[PDB]
Amino acid sequence: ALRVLVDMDGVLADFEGGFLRKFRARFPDQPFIALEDRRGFWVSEQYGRLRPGLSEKAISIWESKNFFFELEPLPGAVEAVKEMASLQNTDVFICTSPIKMFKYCPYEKYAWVEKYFGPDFLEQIVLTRDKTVVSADLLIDDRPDITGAEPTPSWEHVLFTACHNQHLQLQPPRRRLHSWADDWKAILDSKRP
Amino acid sequence: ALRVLVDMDGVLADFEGGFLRKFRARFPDQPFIALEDRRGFWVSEQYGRLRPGLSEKAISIWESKNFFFELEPLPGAVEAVKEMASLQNTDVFICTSPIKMFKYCPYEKYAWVEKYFGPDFLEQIVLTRDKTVVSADLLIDDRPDITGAEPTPSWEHVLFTACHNQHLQLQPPRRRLHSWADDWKAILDSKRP
Numbered sequence: 425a426l427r428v429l430v431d432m433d434g435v436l437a438d439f440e441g442g443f444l445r446k447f448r449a450r451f452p453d454q455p456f457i458a459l460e461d462r463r464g465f466w467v468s469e470q471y472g473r474l475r476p477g478l479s480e481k482a483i484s485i486w487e488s489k490n491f492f493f494e495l496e497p498l499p500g501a502v503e504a505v506k507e508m509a510s511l512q513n514t515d516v517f518i519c520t521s522p523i524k525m526f527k528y529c530p531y532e533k534y535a536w537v538e539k540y541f542g543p544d545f546l547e548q549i550v551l552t553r554d555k556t557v558v559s560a561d562l563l564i565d566d567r568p569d570i571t572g573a574e575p576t577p578s579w580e581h582v583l584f585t586a587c588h589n590q591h592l593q594l595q596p597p598r599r600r601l602h603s604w605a606d607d608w609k610a611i612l613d614s615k616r617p
Numbered sequence: 618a619l620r621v622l623v624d625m626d627g628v629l630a631d632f633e634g635g636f637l638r639k640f641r642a643r644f645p646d647q648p649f650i651a652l653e654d655r656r657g658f659w660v661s662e663q664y665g666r667l668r669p670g671l672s673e674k675a676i677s678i679w680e681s682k683n684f685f686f687e688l689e690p691l692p693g694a695v696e697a698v699k700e701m702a703s704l705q706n707t708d709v710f711i712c713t714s715p716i717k718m719f720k721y722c723p724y725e726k727y728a729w730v731e732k733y734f735g736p737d738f739l740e741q742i743v744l745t746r747d748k749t750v751v752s753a754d755l756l757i758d759d760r761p762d763i764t765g766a767e768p769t770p771s772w773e774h775v776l777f778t779a780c781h782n783q784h785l786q787l788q789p790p791r792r793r794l795h796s797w798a799d800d801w802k803a804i805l806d807s808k809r810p
């Protein structure tokens with residue numbers, strides 16, 4: 425079977441929108457970064473440049489209970505992955521990194537998957553801080569540079585569009601999946617025998 | 618670097634001893650299976666044959682809060698893995714499967730690793746129900762038959778001795794690690810260039 429790894433935050437689950445909503449609600453008198461203006465992968469670094477002490481306040485949002493659990497799915501994500509997993513000769517794993525503060529995040533990621541994909545889909549979860557040691561044909565992930573212990577990962581990394589990466593020019597033959605409305609089936613079919 | 622995957626339950630953490638202690642304390646008037654007499658990988662199947670309704674009582678032990686967190690390390694396990702991870706050209710990942718009931722288990726496994734190996738070791742955790750999709754040179758695991766989506770895993774599976782597998786004759790050239798007092802370094806060195 426063709427094997428596809430799908431990232432969670434910024435691909436399945438709307439980490440950026442969730443973060444902004446909760447930040448504004450908790451820190452209504454602080455300045456914030458509109459999603460369109462997000463630059464750089466690390467939210468807290470951008471916030472830290474905007475005002476002193478804002479990096480720590482940003483961090484307190486994703487460390488809070490229910491932050492991960494209450495993320496909304498990105499449009500099309502649940503439908504696409506469900507269809508993808510039902511395709512013949514196609515094994516789909518949700519491959520995601522928990523944050524360092526582990527009190528809520530791993531638990532809530534399991535709970536989120538159960539909620540949107542159902543109990544049977546829990547067998548498809550891989551939690552890891554290193555994706556290069558997970559072998560597959562494809563990795564769909566919004567992070568531009570994915571590295572770790574394995575210098576030559578078996579997967580092709582398809583960059584999932586996010587505001588933070590939308591301007592990035594990629595080194596051919598690297599490619600993008602622009603959203604779940606985009607033609608993911610053609611990408612998968614291009615890797616099949 | 619040589620890459621080694623190490624299982625948690627029955628290899629690092631004493632799932633069998635922990636289970637028995639808690640079962641006896643919770644169900645003092647039920648019969649139990651002494652560790653020496655454990656047969657078959659699945660604890661609940663053996664308990665279920667011993668008396669009707671015992672399978673469900675067994676399951677309630679590992680579903681309970683603090684079951685995973687309070688497991689004792691197997692003798693030598695923490696020392697060995699710490700030394701192993703400090704070796705040159707050697708990357709060690711703790712590769713473990715959470716149980717289906719996810720309320721406590723993933724969280725407590727992270728907490729256990731932090732407790733025995735320290736915060737920095739949390740980056741080395743891989744949670745998965747499928748180990749065949751994790752690529753490495755070696756997998757040290759007490760489970761005799763490890764299968765999943767990848768029909769030809771890259772690792773050599775070294776069987777870690779447990780009471781449930783201690784009589785098993787293995788198909789050459791399959792081999793065992795008899796305990797952490799056993800010569801794990803020689804096993805690793807045998808895979809190096």
Ligand SMILES: O=c1[nH]c(=O)n([C@H]2C[C@H]3O[C@](c4ccccc4)(P(=O)(O)O)OC[C@H]3O2)cc1/C=C/P(=O)(O)O
Pocket residue numbers: 431432433434439465466467468486520521522523524525553567
């Ligand atoms: O896209 C993101 N942007 C972002 O700013 N963060 C935040 C949350 C927290 O995540 C981490 C993080 C680093 C690597 C992998 C997951 C999370 P940490 O666990 O180190 O605190 O990095 C610093 C912080 O940055 C996470 C993510 C999620 C990364 P992925 O989608 O899990 O790869």
Ligand SMILES: O=c1[nH]c(=O)n([C@H]2C[C@H]3O[C@](c4ccccc4)(P(=O)(O)O)OC[C@H]3O2)cc1/C=C/P(=O)(O)O
Pocket residue numbers: 624625626627632658659660661679713714715716717718746760
């Ligand atoms: O060795 C074991 N023996 C055992 O009886 N169990 C119990 C706990 C529960 O674990 C499971 C289980 C199945 C596969 C992988 C982990 C756990 P489930 O999550 O399906 O309930 O299997 C049924 C039950 O069997 C777990 C383990 C731990 C298996 P690993 O060390 O995680 O591979």
Ligand SMILES: [Mg+2]
Pocket residue numbers: 431432433434435565566567
């Ligand atoms: Mg992401």
Ligand SMILES: [Mg+2]
Pocket residue numbers: 624625626627628758759760
């Ligand atoms: Mg085990």
